[PDB]
Paper text:
The Zrt/Irt-like protein (ZIP) family of solute carrier 39A (SLC39A) membrane transporters is critical in maintaining appropriate cellular levels of zinc. ZIPs represent the only identified zinc importers in mammals, providing metal transfer from the extracellular space or from internal storage vesicles to the cytoplasm.
Notably, even initial analysis disclosed that the new structure is metal-free, as the metal-binding region is void of density or anomalous signal from bound cation. By investigating the crystal packing in our metal-free BbZIP structure, we identify two separate dimers displaying a parallel (i.e., inside-in/inside-in) crystal packing. Detailed structural comparisons of the metal-free and metal-bound inward-open structures expose notable differences for one of the two protomers (chain B), with an overall RMSD of 1.75 Å (hereafter referred to as the ion-free structure). The analysis reveals a considerable displacement of the transport domain, with the ion-free form being shifted around 3 Å toward the intracellular inside, combined with a substantial twist that tilts the domain 11°. The resolved part represents 30 N-terminal amino acids and a highly tilted helix, interacting only with TM3 and TM6 and peripherally relative to the dimer assembly.
Numbering used by the authors:
A (entry chain A): 21 to 149, 164 to 309
B (entry chain B): 21 to 77, 84 to 147, 164 to 220, 225 to 307
Amino acid sequence: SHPLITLGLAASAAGVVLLLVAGIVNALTGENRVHVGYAVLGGAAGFAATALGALMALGLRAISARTQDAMLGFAAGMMLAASAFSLILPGLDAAGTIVGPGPAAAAVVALGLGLGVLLMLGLDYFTPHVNRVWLFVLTIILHNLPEGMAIGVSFATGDLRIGLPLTSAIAIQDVPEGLAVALALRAVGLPIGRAVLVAVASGLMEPLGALVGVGISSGFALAYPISMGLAAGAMIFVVSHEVIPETHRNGHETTATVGLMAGFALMMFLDTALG
Amino acid sequence: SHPLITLGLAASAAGVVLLLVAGIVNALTGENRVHVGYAVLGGAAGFAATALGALMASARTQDAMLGFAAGMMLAASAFSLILPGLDAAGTIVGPGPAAAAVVALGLGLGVLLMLGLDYFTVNRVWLFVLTIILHNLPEGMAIGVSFATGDLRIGLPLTSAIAIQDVPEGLAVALALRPIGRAVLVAVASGLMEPLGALVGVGISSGFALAYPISMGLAAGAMIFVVSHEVIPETHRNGHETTATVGLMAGFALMMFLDTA
């Protein structure tokens, strides 16, 4: 019948629901702590940067494949580095305060990572790939939800040192993403204003994702490092499965790799400068 | 030709933009002490109510719920938004006609925003879908404004009224979007403008001391317009108003009873 991916999806969605309900219940039993505010601001920055990129498509009505390969390589490189330096490693530091240090902390983050990958892997396998247009639009609007989620997760401590570099890196990555989303939507056949409209709307999952992110991470002390892994795993999958294969659209692999390494090193700079 | 509605809409949208930017700037640069946790809890509740409605996919039982919500919404507009807005403005400029002016500005802007948003609701489906989803934005904003101070005594009554409103609206939005699958999906997505709107509602109400009573009037004026121009007259499309008339009476009376606990 079905692969174990279906069981992974079910257990990951159940885990997300359990984490999110634990968040709500705790938020219904605790008071006077800011940590929603920066997650909201960071998600709003994500929306605004995604809109800025999309609006550039109105004039730059198409770009060379070399530019696409460069742009999405840069986007991929930023988000792989951000998953490592701003999610996984601070998750291991956080889980090191509770059950670790040492591999007890790694088990908590690996539980996160597996849930994040199995969620996104399951969601992809339940796309059939009644039109490409509607399936692709649905895919696009949801695409930024793990980016919001990473924002809200990283800010769930209120810590500028963790959330600001990731949010800056996502915000910077959102401009290529929103532009490339808008131009892809045009190429599918939507009028450019309708394509740019949907691309702007895709940024609304970045605030909404940041609400989900601050939720799932708040219910209990280990829900934070679990959610750090979950956001990292969801991002890592989405980068490896959505973004990176679109960086080879006409074989400009050198251009794509220069973008990747530039984005990776830029994210390392952002964390070194803002952390 | 284009009446003063065009001016009033544009000036009120500029007011929303101004208020929101002031709230952002205060958040980024002030010792901001605004409450937003309850607002996103209330906005998520509004989404969930709108989703449940869409998953419900004669009209007289819906007219009963629409009348009941409308009653709850009018009472919450008066007792939860306008009067604590007047008390808030009475902490700064008033009491008396000075405090009344600050809330009346809010009420005007709120009314004018909705009066303009209604203006445009062939493939005109795109404009219908746009207006459909955005209709939940002011509902979100009112929730956010009601929770901006963290008073459960204010945020719970209004958010309940809007959540009860959201159940018939979810069904109505799905049904008015007409298989049902992508229509109910878009109805579920429409509910997501209430969490988003609740962030906007907290934002506009936060830049400066008077931004709270202005936004309380703005929330109240928008929701009163929604009731007076949409939710109530939607009944007379079906049968007669009577069942919603009893809904209006009962919902209004219940709300002020719960306020008198």
